[PDB]
Amino acid sequence: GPLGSARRLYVGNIPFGITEEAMMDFFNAQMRLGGLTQAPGNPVLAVQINQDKNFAFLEFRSVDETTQAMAFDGIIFQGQSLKIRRPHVYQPLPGAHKLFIGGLPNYLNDDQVKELLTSFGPLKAFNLVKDSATGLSKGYAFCEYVDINVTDQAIAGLNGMQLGDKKLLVQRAS
Amino acid sequence: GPLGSARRLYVGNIPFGITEEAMMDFFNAQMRLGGLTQAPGNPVLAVQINQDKNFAFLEFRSVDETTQAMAFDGIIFQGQSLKIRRPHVYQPLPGAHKLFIGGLPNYLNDDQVKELLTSFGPLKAFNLVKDSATGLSKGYAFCEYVDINVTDQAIAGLNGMQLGDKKLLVQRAS
Known part of the structure; x- marks a missing residue:
């Protein structure tokens, strides 16, 4: 979702042939090893891999553990340095x-x-x-x-719109 | 009322995604930093959040500390100016x-x-x-x-004001 996006991370430069479960084990092990977990159990719930374009997304159980995992930028996995970033739709x-x-x-x-x-x-x-x-x-x-990205177009289209005997106010709620 | 809901407050405009525990810690800390607590221990007992409609209710341990906390109206919490009010069924x-x-x-x-x-x-x-x-x-x-709350506004707006030849007096009757 929106804060579905606050629990994902992009992973680039993934090794050839890696599986989604193997990626999962690696990041869970790293989280535990570095003591970055806020609770017992596994922080990484799921992994989606695009083999053709050599990237994956991780999905975490919590917002804070996701943020902690940004620390793994450049971590070595099967001899390769992973690139770790926020999703492009991430809201700071x-x-x-x-x-x-x-x-x-x-x-x-x-x-x-x-x-x-x-x-x-x-x-x-x-x-x-x-x-x-x-x-x-x-x-x-x-x-x-x-x-x-459609928010500002919605405001432009709808703010001020005459609606019966009413006039709409559309703005960021703040 | 007449004596109902004397230990609850409405809190509007809460920060998106905030937990009940974080809000409780914030208010308990502010009560303490602001010199509004009247005894050892936490003044705020519980927080109930409606995440859908972006509001909370604070439950206080005592009647007088609930009254004191009204002074927090407008306090900034994670970017948000909080709207602090009596419960709607509360009546003086x-x-x-x-x-x-x-x-x-x-x-x-x-x-x-x-x-x-x-x-x-x-x-x-x-x-x-x-x-x-x-x-x-x-x-x-x-x-x-x-x-x-209109009481003070009416007084501010009408007391001492010219009305014909007379000066108006507007004041609390007791």
Whole structure:
């Protein structure tokens, strides 16, 4: 997901013929050896390998252990120095691209508001705020897109949009 | 209320992905650094987070320390200015923030006087004192805002202010 991305690392320069399980054993052993684990057990949950382009992704059980594992940049595996980096979609400041959407007609339900939003791309997060007593919409929502690069286009397309007798406010929620 | 939820606070705008334990440690530390703790031990007992809607409730060990912690409103926590509030079902005892309004023109009626007051927020209580036999106004009134935080705003906004030839007096009635 979004913080699915905070638990992954890119690994380059992987040795020829390596298997996903072997990679897993190596990094779990390294984490334990260096005492970088925050709990008993294995920090690396899974590995996906692209053999043709000589890279892999590691998926970790926690955000902090992932960060610790950046320390392994340049580590030797079967005689080769691994390249360790963040995923390109990694967010150093999480929630930075969460949007606030105000000025919604208060009769719109979840599905209807998302339909307005998903015209720019899929969402990973959404919620329409309602009065708990009555279940009536308070007229504002929050969301976050799968691809954070569409955030600013969504704002450009939707902020100020006349919606019935209402005028949308779309901005980063901060 | 009337005595319900005197040891809980609403915390809005919490940092994305924060755990209940981290928030608890932060507030317990601030209580201590800020000189707001009133005894050995932690003032904050528990934290309940709604991760979907980005808020928490703090549970305190004592009534008075809950009141003290209101002073943290706006504190920055991992980039975020926290919104600290009483629980919505929390209610002050009746009359706690009653206002006296003196110096009114005596030819104005109830609604005409209410209009000046409700510009700050809705009223849960109001009475313009009238000459009972004739029904005519003695030029002073009492009121009570639904939101008690509005009280100081109404005072700031109306006290000592010119209204016709008169200077208005607006103050807590007790």
